[PDB]
């Protein structure tokens, strides 16, 4: 369950500052690392965000025609995975493609969806050596990842918290008639709220009634009745002022999300390649 | 010293979610999927999928960082 | 690394277990096993006094090991032990104990799905923890298939039995039944040697069910057609038990896995609440 759950213990963070500060830690260790071990070759926290954001959405590109269909709660454990031990590790140390593939890898293991190392392999499109290579370095990086979680596998998506209210809305909310119709944005607005660093920042059942919330907004229907009726926030004054921040703050994430340019990606990847093969 | 039941003192810093027990009487179970015959001999039922979504749905609602 | 190795503890299908500095180390092109797996992603999640912690985790490359707490017997040793009394209040104390834990893990969505003497650890203070979570699941989706070869065949629920695919809290509470009457008569209940073998016993010893009291029988996929047996009645079985305790065991043991009593339902039963009340751990007996 969530509210006792470790990814709200440890991986829920009070600001994108906190993040900012893990991720630029992250990468002065690595800077240090190198120069002891024995500069234009390092990057830049930003590059590094750069990189993720881009090896972020291939890891959505893998898990999306991925045979047999992955589920979408492996996806975001996957998802979840990558952003979490890039917050602590530099893309430098780790390489990004390798990393996601044994995110999914993990997911896959920890979700309970049963797929064989052969059919995992067989999905990407390189020869057959390539995939044997790549199953070698996921085997050799899945133990890193779970370190680098802490052990911390399970991970609460938004989307069963989003069936939750969508139930919860068809039962105790009339006037929203057909609450379906408010499914397919709201679940567009959650691709994009996982494009952000939403999932470190706010629980998933917060996530999923903004991205409700948002489609609402969008269709013209105004339903905060919902929650100071339906979730009694009439009361708590405070409550839904803060529950009401809180949702302002992470439409104002998702409006503030520039995604990589591919101009830029091309110099980063290079960037990455040379300080891979450099070290 | 005899034993007195008490229930699990759990935080969900969230909305009340309705008793499972209660679920039918209030209307959920209109909004969730029929347990198949088979599933019911097993001990499965729409009930609990429906309790199930509801305390995810309101679990850390109002809980902040 | 930084533990040892004192003395073998126990093999199992997946892993052995030895103790080490006091902790106990389950040492485990596929990877890293996916039982460890679901033990850690399990057992991360849960804080009970009545489940089992874990505490470290380590291995290179695809091997695992998991450390726990040290612990320092379990329910099949106190059963087996023929020096040991097991008084009506070592036996609501033991039933206690195991319903509160399973209590606190059927709440978070998750059977236990392997409960038997041996899975139920104590320690020299008399706590009982639930442990071995290598086939815990978690349950609520009906989109998450499950399989019916889970709980050893002594203890397992007559719709596992009967293949069902979906189940709920039921398959735990049966065997806590079957514990149960493992504490009171000292010997395995339904020794089965079979699949077959296990329903037969379970039917000749409570009678056969019919729909009234499993409405759904017959549309599990492996459900086969047994002679009517009378069954013995339960204060036949177990001659020294109360009306309270015949009540729990009735309730644990009924055939309809929704009819079968929660683990919260069983601690509100007027079995707990009675005289004399529960062991407490520091009394609780030790071999
Ligand atoms: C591993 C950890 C939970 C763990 C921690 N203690 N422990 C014990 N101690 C009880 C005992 C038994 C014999 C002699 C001395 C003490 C047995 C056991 N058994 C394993 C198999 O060995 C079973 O699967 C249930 O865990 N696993 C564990």
Known sequence: ?279 | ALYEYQPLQIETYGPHVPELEMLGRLGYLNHVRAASPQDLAGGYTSSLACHRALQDAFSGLFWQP | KRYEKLDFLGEGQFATVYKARIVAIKKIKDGINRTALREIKLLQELSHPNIIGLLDAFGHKSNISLVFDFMETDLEVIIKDNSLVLTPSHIKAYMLMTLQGLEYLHQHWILHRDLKPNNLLLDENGVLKLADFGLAKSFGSPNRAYTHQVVTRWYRAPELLFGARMYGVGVDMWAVGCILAELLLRVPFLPGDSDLDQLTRIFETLGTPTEEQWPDMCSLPDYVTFKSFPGIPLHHIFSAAGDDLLDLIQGLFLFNPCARITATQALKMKYFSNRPGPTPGCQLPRP
Not at chain 1, 100 to 129: H, I, W, Y
């Open chain 1, 1 to 279: 369950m969530y509210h006792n759950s470790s990814q709200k213990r440890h991986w829920t963070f009070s600001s994108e500052e906190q993040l900012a500060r893990l991720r630029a830690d992250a990468n002065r260790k690595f800077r240090c690392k190198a120069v002891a071990n024995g500069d234009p070759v390092f990057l830049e926290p930003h590059e590094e965000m750069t990189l993720c954001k881009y090896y972020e959405k291939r890891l959505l590109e893998f898990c999306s025609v991925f045979k047999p269909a992955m589920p979408r709660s492996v996806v975001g454990t996957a998802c979840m995975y990558f952003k979490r031990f890039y917050l602590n590790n530099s893309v430098m140390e780790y390489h990004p493609r390798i990393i996601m593939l044994t995110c999914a890898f993990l997911a896959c293991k920890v979700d309970e969806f049963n797929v064989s190392s052969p059919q995992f392999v067989g999905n990407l499109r390189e020869s057959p050596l390539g995939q044997e290579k790549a199953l070698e370095q996921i085997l050799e990086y899945e133990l890193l990842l779970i370190q680098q979680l802490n052990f911390h596998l399970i991970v609460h998506n938004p989307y069963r918290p989003f069936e939750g209210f969508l139930i919860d809305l068809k039962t105790r909310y009339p006037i929203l008639e057909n609450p379906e119709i408010l499914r397919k944005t709201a679940d567009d607005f959650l691709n994009r709220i996982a494009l952000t660093d939403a999932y470190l920042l706010y629980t998933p059942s917060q996530i999923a009634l903004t991205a409700i919330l948002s489609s609402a907004s969008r269709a013209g229907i105004t339903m905060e009745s919902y929650l100071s009726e339906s979730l009694m926030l009439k009361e708590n004054r405070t409550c839904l002022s803060q529950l009401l921040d809180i949702m302002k703050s992470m439409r104002n994430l998702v409006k503030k999300y520039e995604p990589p340019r591919s101009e830029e990606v091309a110099v980063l990847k290079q960037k990455l390649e040379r300080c891979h093969s450099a070290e």
